[PDB]
Ligand binder design. Structure first.
Ligand code: MN
Ligand code: MN
Ligand code: MN
Length: 192
């Protein structure tokens, strides 16, 4: 059955462009989910977050190491950005995820609630010694939450993600509105 995915973003109060960006891309039973947060706020941050997302999309199915290394190259000379990507291979029942910087990922799975470890750094400026790719098993019903630091780590009550009285689209909007800081850009993806 289809993976339901909701996206929500909101600019920092007073800005007219959101400095965070989201990507959901479906490719032959493999789904990619990404959030980027351009350093700072406003249109220069937005430019960087969108460059990061566009770069990822162009690099899909070359492997996360390559994906993040090209992101870093395309972001040289810009604001820079931090970013997370989850690659969910539903057909083979596997996921991989990695994070450069402070995007937050949580994966609620039949195997347990798993929070992938971020590697410090800023794409475009300081690439980590090496990317730490978390790996796990996926089965239908597992939930993925990704958000920028517009929402504090651990702010979202987990059980809300298993509430199917709201759609994923409705749920990420509620999450962004309840938990999103108004002094920063906010971006959230939920997939289930
Ligand atoms: Mn930012
Ligand atoms: Mn489902
Ligand atoms: Mn931020």
């Amino acid at each position: 059955e289809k993976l339901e995915v909701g996206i929500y973003t909101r600019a920092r109060e007073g800005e007219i462009a959101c400095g965070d960006a989201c990507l959901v891309k479906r490719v032959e039973g493999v789904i990619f989910l990404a959030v980027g947060d351009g350093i700072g706020h406003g249109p220069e941050a937005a430019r960087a977050a969108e460059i990061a997302i566009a770069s990822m999309e162009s690099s899909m199915n070359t492997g996360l190491v390559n994906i993040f290394q090209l992101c870093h190259r395309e972001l040289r000379g810009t604001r820079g950005a931090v970013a997370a990507l989850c690659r969910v291979d539903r057909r083979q029942g596997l996921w991989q995820a990695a994070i450069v910087g402070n995007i937050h990922v949580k994966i609620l799975s039949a195997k347990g609630i798993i929070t992938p470890l971020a590697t410090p750094g800023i794409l475009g400026y300081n690439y980590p010694h090496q990317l730490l790719i978390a790996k796990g098993s996926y089965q239908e019903g597992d939930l993925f939450l990704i958000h920028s630091d517009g929402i504090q780590e651990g702010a979202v009550p987990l059980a809300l993600l298993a509430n199917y009285r709201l759609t994923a689209e409705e749920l990420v909007r509620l999450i962004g509105e309840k938990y999103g800081r108004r002094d920063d850009d906010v971006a959230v993806i939920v997939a289930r």
